[PDB]
Design a protein around this ligand. Structure first.
Ligand code: L2C
Ligand code: F09
Ligand code: K
Ligand code: K
Ligand code: K
Ligand code: K
Lengths: 103, 212, 219, 219
């Protein structure tokens, strides 16, 4: 398959890894901080997803330095991964239009 | 830190009746509350998780409800085995915290105590000691008085008493009274008697034995 | 099988320190946290701290004086709590519990009774308690065993190696002159004793001793 | 037309169970939820649970003992509530209501009066109540009907098949010896009776009976 499709698949796998790792690390970073809510794994996984998609409801978020650092990694991974899917779609469309034009 | 208030601290109910334990959180914690049962001399045991989720192995009798700041643990048709201390615990915010606990007490039918008196063992006497033990078992209410008599005269020195908490088997109480004397002291006395006075009878229940 | 195994008791001299252990079995995951909870006699449960074995990170209750230090050994699947410079205020039952990272304590250890005292360990003397020859019986007979002169708490009393459970009452210990004393009561059909044997088993963790005492009628 | 149809009453022996029904008509959408509400005599409304017919999912009030099980039949547009192992505490009026998925109960059923008792069903005896020959009249005359010896509740009393509404008073039933008794009063212009007929109609759902009793002057 073409590069853009391979890259998209890879990006998806990497994002899943980051969501899982981010959830584990977020709990690790936040427990020990009075008042923190990102402290159990199931909801931390949910938090990682709404952060990677940049939805950010505000129901859960990190209060510590390391939790916030983990958060930035999750954000960047989500933004870049979805952006890469967009880039792959554009490449697919560009190629199809070239053909349709007989170029 | 989240404060969990469990009030009242003691709940008195009759057999088969429905009972409800209260747990109020100082701030909203969604449904992140869990309930534990701890019987006398036992370790805590998880009963309900996330306010209402059942735990495999726990009688259907137990249920939970609530969200936010007000939670309830309910027991449909209480029985003797339910006698214990119940605690709530929150996991919404760090650190996890526990409520102060609520004790479940059962109001059963009055029961006269079964009294038993025991002479000191030969093994003990051999070591120069003499302990006379009296058991006042399975009575209710818990209020009870024991009186010792040696050769007909009331004795008070050397007597130590111990009461059990309400029994999770039959909802009754029991008490032990131990008169400890030196072998010598024990040797120069004939009869020993244990007298129990309970509201179930205007007359005391007496048990005794003669050293000879 | 028992998921969390803890020693029954530990005697500690004031000022000294002790290391409690909690051996775990059953399923183990990287998301597992081991918690320690303190309970003074007659009082509630107090959270001490937690540790995540898969990483070694530990957090502690900020509201109380820090007396504990948590560690864990992955190879032996054992969690440890080092209590140091203890005083009588530290005397209590210390439980370890396992949390799967989802907020509740699915399982608890039996707890370790820690006693902070200068007194010396002393195994208990178990004496039989059988009715006198003048005692009349009904459909049931009451027997028992006297456990005195032991230190520190606790002692576990069972009847017929645990096979005899119903009709058993073990009274709270009484302290006098640096020694504890308690009795246990057992009631069985009068027609079954002494035909069918009745023995009490007394275990005293602090002295690593466990003795049996058969209850037979008086001469 | 009536959007939610419920049976008038159900008699249930303690320990037994019963299945209440609620037939719906009018517009129906996939977003419709059917709710059940319980109301003890003289008390407030208590939410029991809900079910979404288009999917079959049901939720229940967690604060109370679960006595109900909800189901629904799409073809017959009927919702059901199975109440099991009932006691006198379960005696009450049970309403079904329809919610369009937007939070409020736009319409309610007439309710089913459920009575948990060992007593037996008994249709009522309807007797006429006409003035004595010595009673003087004014511009109005008061007539009525005595409904006694019935069980269980309720009974619906109407005058002239419902065409006569004004000036009507039906008193709350009184229970005595496992049987209910009540009377209904009707007042009409003295000049209209007995020229214009006056009849009371008494319906007793539990016994599937409905009888009429014309009120005529005494011999
Ligand atoms: C002027 C430019 C901005 C400079 C800001 C200061 C440097 C950054 C952190 C210092 C940490 C500290 O000593 O404090 C941690 C704090 C402790 O109370 O808690 C905190 O949780 C604050 C965390 C800030 C997270 C930033 C994440 C960026 C990827
Ligand atoms: C991505 C940041 C490093 C992972 C989190 C480490 C937390 C250590 C304990 O505070
Ligand atoms: K947002
Ligand atoms: K927001
Ligand atoms: K918000
Ligand atoms: K907000």
């Amino acid at each position: 398959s073409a590069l853009h499709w391979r890259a998209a698949g890879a990006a998806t796998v990497l994002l899943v890894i980051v969501l899982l790792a981010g959830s584990y690390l977020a709990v690790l970073a936040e427990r020990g901080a009075p008042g923190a809510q990102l402290i159990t794994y199931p909801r931390a996984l949910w938090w990682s997803v709404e952060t990677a998609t940049t939805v950010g409801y505000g129901d859960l978020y990190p209060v510590t330095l390391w939790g916030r650092c983990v958060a930035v990694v999750v954000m960047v991974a989500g933004i870049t991964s979805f952006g890469l899917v967009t880039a792959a779609l554009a490449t697919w469309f560009v190629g199809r239009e070239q053909e349709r034009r007989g170029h | 830190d989240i404060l969990l208030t469990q009030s009242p601290a003691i709940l008195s109910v009759s057999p088969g009746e429905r009972v409800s334990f209260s747990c109020r959180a100082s701030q909203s914690i969604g449904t992140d509350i869990h309930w534990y049962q701890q019987r006398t001399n036992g370790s805590p045991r998880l009963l309900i998780k996330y306010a209402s989720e059942s735990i495999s192995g726990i009688p259907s009798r137990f249920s939970g409800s609530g969200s936010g700041t007000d939670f309830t643990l309910s027991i449909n048709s209480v029985e003797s085995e339910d006698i214990a201390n119940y605690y709530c615990q929150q996991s919404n915010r760090w650190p996890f915290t526990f409520g102060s606990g609520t004790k479940l007490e059962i109001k059963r039918a009055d029961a006269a105590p079964t009294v038993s008196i025991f002479p000191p063992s030969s093994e003990q006497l051999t070591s120069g000691g003499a302990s006379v033990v009296c058991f006042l078992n399975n009575f209710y209410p818990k209020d009870i008085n024991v009186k010792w008599k040696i050769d007909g005269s009331e004795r008070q020195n050397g007597v130590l008493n111990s009461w059990t908490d309400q029994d999770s088997k039959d909802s009754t109480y029991s008490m032990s009274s131990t008169l400890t004397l030196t072998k010598d002291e024990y040797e120069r006395h004939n009869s020993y008697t244990c007298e129990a006075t309970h509201k179930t009878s205007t007359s005391p229940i007496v048990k005794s034995f003669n050293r000879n | 099988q028992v998921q969390l195994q803890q020693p029954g008791a530990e005697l500690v001299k004031p000022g000294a320190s002790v290391k409690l252990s909690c051996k775990a079995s059953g399923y183990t995951f990287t998301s597992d946290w081991i918690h320690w909870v303190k309970q003074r006699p007659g009082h509630g449960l107090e959270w001490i701290g937690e540790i995540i074995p898969s990483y070694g990170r530990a957090n502690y209750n900020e509201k109380i004086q820090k007396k504990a230090t948590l560690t864990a050994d992955k190879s032996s699947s054992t969690a440890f709590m080092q209590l140091s410079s203890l005083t009588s205020e530290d005397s209590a039952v210390y439980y370890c519990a396992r949390e799967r990272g989802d907020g509740y304590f699915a399982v608890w250890g039996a707890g370790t009774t820690v006693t902070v005292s200068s007194a010396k360990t002393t195994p208990p003397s178990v004496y039989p308690l059988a009715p006198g020859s003048a005692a009349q019986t009904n459909s049931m007979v009451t027997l028992g065993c006297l456990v005195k002169g032991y230190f520190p708490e606790p002692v576990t009393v069972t009847w017929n190696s645990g096979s005899l459970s119903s009709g058993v009452h073990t009274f709270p210990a009484v302290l006098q002159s640096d020694l504890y004393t308690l009795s246990s009561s057992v009631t069985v059909p009068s027609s079954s004793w002494p035909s069918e044997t009745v023995t009490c088993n007394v275990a005293h963790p602090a002295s690593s001793t466990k003795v049996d005492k058969k209850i037979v009628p008086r001469d």
